[PDB]
Amino acid sequence: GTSQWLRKTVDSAAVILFSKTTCPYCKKVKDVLAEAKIKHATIELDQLSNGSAIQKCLASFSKIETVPQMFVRGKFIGDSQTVLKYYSNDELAGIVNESKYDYDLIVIGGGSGGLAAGKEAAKYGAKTAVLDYVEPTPIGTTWGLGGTCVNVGCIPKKLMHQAGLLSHALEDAEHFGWSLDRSKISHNWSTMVEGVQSHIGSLNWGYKVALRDNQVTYLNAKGRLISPHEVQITDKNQKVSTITGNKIILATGERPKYPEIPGAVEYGITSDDLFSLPYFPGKTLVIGASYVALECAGFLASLGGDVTVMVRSILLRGFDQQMAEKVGDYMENHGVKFAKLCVPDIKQLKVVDTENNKPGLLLVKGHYTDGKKFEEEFETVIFAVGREPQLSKVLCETVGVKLDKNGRVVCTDDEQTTVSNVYAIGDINAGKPQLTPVAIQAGRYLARRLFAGATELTDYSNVATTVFTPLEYGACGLSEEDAIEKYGDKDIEVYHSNFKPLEWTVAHREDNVCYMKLVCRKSDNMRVLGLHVLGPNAGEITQGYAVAIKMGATKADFDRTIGIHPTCSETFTTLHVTKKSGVSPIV
Amino acid sequence: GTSQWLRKTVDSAAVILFSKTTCPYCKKVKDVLAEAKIKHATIELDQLSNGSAIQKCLASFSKIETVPQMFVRGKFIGDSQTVLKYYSNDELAGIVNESKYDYDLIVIGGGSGGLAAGKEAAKYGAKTAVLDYVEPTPIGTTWGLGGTCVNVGCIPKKLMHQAGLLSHALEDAEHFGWSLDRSKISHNWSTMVEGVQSHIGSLNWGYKVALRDNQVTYLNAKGRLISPHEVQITDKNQKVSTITGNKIILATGERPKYPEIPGAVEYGITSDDLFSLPYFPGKTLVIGASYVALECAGFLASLGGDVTVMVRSILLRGFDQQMAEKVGDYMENHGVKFAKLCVPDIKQLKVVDTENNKPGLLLVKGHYTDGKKFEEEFETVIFAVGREPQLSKVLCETVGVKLDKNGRVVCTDDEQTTVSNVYAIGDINAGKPQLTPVAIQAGRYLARRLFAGATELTDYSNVATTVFTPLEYGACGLSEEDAIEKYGDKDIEVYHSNFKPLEWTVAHREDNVCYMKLVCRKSDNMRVLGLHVLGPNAGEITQGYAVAIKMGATKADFDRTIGIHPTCSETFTTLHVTKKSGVSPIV
Ligand SMILES: Cc1cc2nc3c(=O)[nH]c(=O)nc-3n(C[C@H](O)[C@H](O)[C@H](O)COP(=O)(O)OP(=O)(O)OC[C@H]3O[C@@H](n4cnc5c(N)ncnc54)[C@H](O)[C@@H]3O)c2cc1C
Numbered sequence A, B: 001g002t003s004q005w006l007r008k009t010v011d012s013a014a015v016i017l018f019s020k021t022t023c024p025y026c027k028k029v030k031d032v033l034a035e036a037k038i039k040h041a042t043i044e045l046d047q048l049s050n051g052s053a054i055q056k057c058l059a060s061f062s063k064i065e066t067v068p069q070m071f072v073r074g075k076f077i078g079d080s081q082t083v084l085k086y087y088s089n090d091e092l093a094g095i096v097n098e099s100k101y102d103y104d105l106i107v108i109g110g111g112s113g114g115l116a117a118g119k120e121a122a123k124y125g126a127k128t129a130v131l132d133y134v135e136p137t138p139i140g141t142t143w144g145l146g147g148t149c150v151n152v153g154c155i156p157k158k159l160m161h162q163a164g165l166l167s168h169a170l171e172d173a174e175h176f177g178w179s180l181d182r183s184k185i186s187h188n189w190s191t192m193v194e195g196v197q198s199h200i201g202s203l204n205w206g207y208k209v210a211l212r213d214n215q216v217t218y219l220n221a222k223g224r225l226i227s228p229h230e231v232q233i234t235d236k237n238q239k240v241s242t243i244t245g246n247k248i249i250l251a252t253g254e255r256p257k258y259p260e261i262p263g264a265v266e267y268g269i270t271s272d273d274l275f276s277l278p279y280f281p282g283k284t285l286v287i288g289a290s291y292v293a294l295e296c297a298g299f300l301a302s303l304g305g306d307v308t309v310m311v312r313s314i315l316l317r318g319f320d321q322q323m324a325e326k327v328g329d330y331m332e333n334h335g336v337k338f339a340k341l342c343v344p345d346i347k348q349l350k351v352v353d354t355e356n357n358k359p360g361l362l363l364v365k366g367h368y369t370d371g372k373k374f375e376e377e378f379e380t381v382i383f384a385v386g387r388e389p390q391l392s393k394v395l396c397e398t399v400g401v402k403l404d405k406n407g408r409v410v411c412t413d414d415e416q417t418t419v420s421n422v423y424a425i426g427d428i429n430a431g432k433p434q435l436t437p438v439a440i441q442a443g444r445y446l447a448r449r450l451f452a453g454a455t456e457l458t459d460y461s462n463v464a465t466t467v468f469t470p471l472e473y474g475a476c477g478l479s480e481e482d483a484i485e486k487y488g489d490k491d492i493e494v495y496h497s498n499f500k501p502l503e504w505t506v507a508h509r510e511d512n513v514c515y516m517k518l519v520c521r522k523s524d525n526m527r528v529l530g531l532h533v534l535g536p537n538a539g540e541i542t543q544g545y546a547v548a549i550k551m552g553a554t555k556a557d558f559d560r561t562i563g564i565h566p567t568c569s570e571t572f573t574t575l576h577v578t579k580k581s582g583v584s585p586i587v
């Protein structure tokens, strides 16, 4: 119990001090360590409810039972007299840098999860390397340190969403008394992209500064795991070499898929290319119906573009389908065209005009599921048909790391792979939600367990989401159809209501488009199984409720909490119309 | 136990059926009542924990132990056969309408609490009257049904705040690529007031339709309680008469105070006048430092006004003072001027030009707390120095209703006054938070206890708030200073952090002005005592966390919950810097 924890903690910690807050000999050792600039984990036994047992177990390692005790990479170094001995004899620095491997930790992948893991590990004295390389897109697009979210994901996507939201702010301003004329105003794409990219550039720089300031080695090189402890690296001159590490974290993420049709790779683009594109896409086809497809089509339409979305089967597969349909109906009422039940079978009519900064022109041919034909011209074609890893590029098959049928890494609930010193975090961890805050939490918590004796695991259940379509959609927990499948229709009650933002009244916007519902379990005290909201600032609205759902909130907890007025979120505190009653949810 | 609940329910309900969902005899009685358009409460005994105990207890009133049993105003009326007998002989309508009083319920006051109480009561067959009258301001301002929030409070105040927020949307849009020039755009006060007043008028009418469709008698008349059951009314022609009622709900609210100085009533205005003012206020002095004072000064400055606030001592007395200082510092940096530690001693220079729609001109003279003098000219002077009831107008002292030293009604935890059939709700209920959703919950919950046999009480603790200053401030729970005073400094831990909205990056707004903190109790598992956030959309951010705080959230609950990215709210899920540590909170 305690003894198995202590043995795991001593074996993998890089530099660790066992201590008590009240001991002057411990304080004496602490003072020497960072005077020598030695980072290390510390465990204060007088703060743990079974530190008495832990203190006894230490003797199995050191032959002594007192504090302080200092260890390095699994070996007892000494008590207070001995550490100080090594200090004044100039032997300490070499003791703490002695290692079987080049690094205590090698992280393959410099994105959301890998940067978080690497920085946290270095805080506790682990000698750490972070490797990052960006394979160019088929047209040559590349970018800096930070991963998919920072460069070609959450950050530029929401900034362009905000640019689209501002179009309605300009419209609304007239009704609130401002003198501008919305009809005489236009949008400049390249001015937007320049501002977005300047912010991304400050993030690239900020990450390189942060790794420097934590004493992390950053290598802009491609990594490949060739045995449990050996990582082969290839740098920008094609020089190949091998570095070794005790623990390995795989954190290499995914890249967009292309469909296997003529012309797709040659003449289309993906989200990887869109966020730094030097010309306005113009008339655009988006192929796909994921949240990436709908978000990109949405802001393009708000920025003045002529936009079509070609949908294989349904919108937002895997999300609540009543909410998916309301999301799409709103988009279709504000500009976006949909080619439903349709797939592509791409021809080039004009080459991209790199000089004058203009798109080319394309003929797209496809068919509907009944066999009728699709044929139309577009200036830009964007594929948003899913994302995949390519771990046969990162991971030799002889190492023994097990993958699933989709090519993701099969892990235990502490992120361990089938190779005992190798872990995986982020989008490549099979079965986990593919989100930046999850990858960050998993990375930081894993670093603390490896190098500071922590025990807390990452909790992957009921993680809230937000889809940033022109009208935003936040959710936490089960869809209504999943809840019914799991418990049966008679054990599920659904409370719901339309609402109108107060900001929308003077602006003459729609009365009954925003919507929210709570999906509850009758036989478990009306437990809230899932929460759904369509409306402005849906992410801000949803976040706080995710804490209450984590704690097991019921309908009664929502009723006894009082609202804040005037807000959209307060509508969750007075819900009363049930779906079974058949009463209308309009307001 | 069960005995005394049943007695209370029978004596108080207007029309109540005791039933079981499975019984076809109950189904037949319900249908008769529905056809005769008789509204009633229903208690389904087969869905209560001790419904079997109630069923035998009903014998004390009816001499029968069976179901259905119908009661009217405390009298047993009959079982299925007997009720059908009265229906067949055309005797039912007179039985259900006969009462010792004109009304089952008279509500004095047609505002947030009063309208909610009256509509809820009528849903269970209580015969209800709602009285409302708006005594004009000193310059003659008056308005329609709905109360302070609807007409001169939360609704018009947040609509003008939105108009002010749009000035920053206009500035921001240039940086996101839109071609307007904020420099050549102006604001028209009267166009704004017209749109706001048109929405308020749709609410006045909506409340009159709602009362009609619930069979509630609405009298636009001044009401005065002269004995426990007698209400004297005065109408628009000064015709005086008396109506009687079984239960009485006092819900008359408050009005703004004026300071006792020359010129104040003659030449100043209050928030009561501001929201329909026919001319732009111009150079404005706001006297006071409550949330009303600051919210009004904030949007006036954003609309292009020259605004000064005169502060007697501190900003936002009663709120967290660190937070209040950050609110005031933001307004000072964005154009509001402050005259600190200063009170007024008002002179007319120009009379309001009612013809060409222009303000007058005033001289304000005052003095600072050390003795220096204040003297300066303003076009409009707005007093926001508090609000008070005047129950001497509403309530004869001989009736016996206890008031406190401030003139508010002293109530038990079920809103009962010292006169057993008289209740008080909303802003006049002493010691309760003076907020619109509180009044609505109190009113709806009380009507159900009186007329449908409900037992749930209103919970007044940890009610969340939002101050809609130009940068908004949301809170739920204790201020930091109140926590320290109640538990001691050694037992309080404070986690805090600055943040920057992603929307502010491309717009080049400030890096370290938004701010958030959690105030926690160490010896109670790091219980979250209070939550505070300064930033955009603060009310949307805070609302959901109020459910978690109601359920007893700890810091570990905030830590194990995952963030939604990119949002402002997610910063709460990863807080780690403590105030004790001395580490900077900047980003
Ligand atoms: C358009 C879009 C929008 C999104 N919006 C959101 C959103 O709003 N909110 C949200 O929570 N999530 C969002 N996501 C998801 C989010 O981007 C991912 O979940 C997150 O980036 C995953 O982090 P990661 O560390 O697992 O991988 P990544 O961030 O992809 O990092 C992996 C890194 O490793 C590098 N690498 C790969 N192979 C090697 C190798 N052999 N050697 C060295 N380096 C290598 C990659 O080039 C990359 O830099 C979005 C994704 C997309 C595509």
Ligand SMILES: Cc1cc2nc3c(=O)[nH]c(=O)nc-3n(C[C@H](O)[C@H](O)[C@H](O)COP(=O)(O)OP(=O)(O)OC[C@H]3O[C@@H](n4cnc5c(N)ncnc54)[C@H](O)[C@@H]3O)c2cc1C
Binding pocket: A564, A565, A566, B108, B109, B110, B111, B112, B113, B114, B131, B132, B133, B134, B135, B146, B147, B148, B149, B152, B153, B154, B155, B157, B221, B222, B223, B224, B251, B252, B253, B254, B271, B292, B393, B394, B425, B426, B427, B428, B434, B435, B436, B437, B439
């Ligand atoms: C400027 C301002 C801004 C505010 N903003 C907010 C906000 O953002 N959020 C929030 O939660 N709260 C806000 N409030 C507070 C909110 O308005 C009040 O808490 C709420 O209106 C109180 O409701 P009530 O039912 O107690 O009284 P009221 O809403 O004031 O209604 C009482 C009614 O009774 C009438 N009456 C009085 N005497 C008699 C009589 N003798 N006979 C007949 N009728 C009579 C009055 O004229 C009035 O119409 C704000 C208040 C102000 C002043």
Ligand SMILES: COc1ccc2sc(N)nc2c1
Binding pocket: A165, A166, A168, A169, A172, B165, B166, B168, B169
């Ligand atoms: C549609 O109305 C809007 C949209 C976006 C924004 S950003 C801001 N400050 N105000 C608004 C108002």
Ligand SMILES: COc1ccc2sc(N)nc2c1
Binding pocket: A133, A220, A221, A222, A234, A235, A236, A237, A238
């Ligand atoms: C930094 O640029 C790089 C880094 C590593 C590699 S491995 C390869 N094949 N090309 C590159 C380019």
Ligand SMILES: COc1ccc2sc(N)nc2c1
Binding pocket: B133, B220, B221, B222, B234, B235, B236, B237, B238
């Ligand atoms: C316009 O409606 C009214 C209603 C009641 C009264 S009592 C009074 N003094 N004036 C009025 C006006």
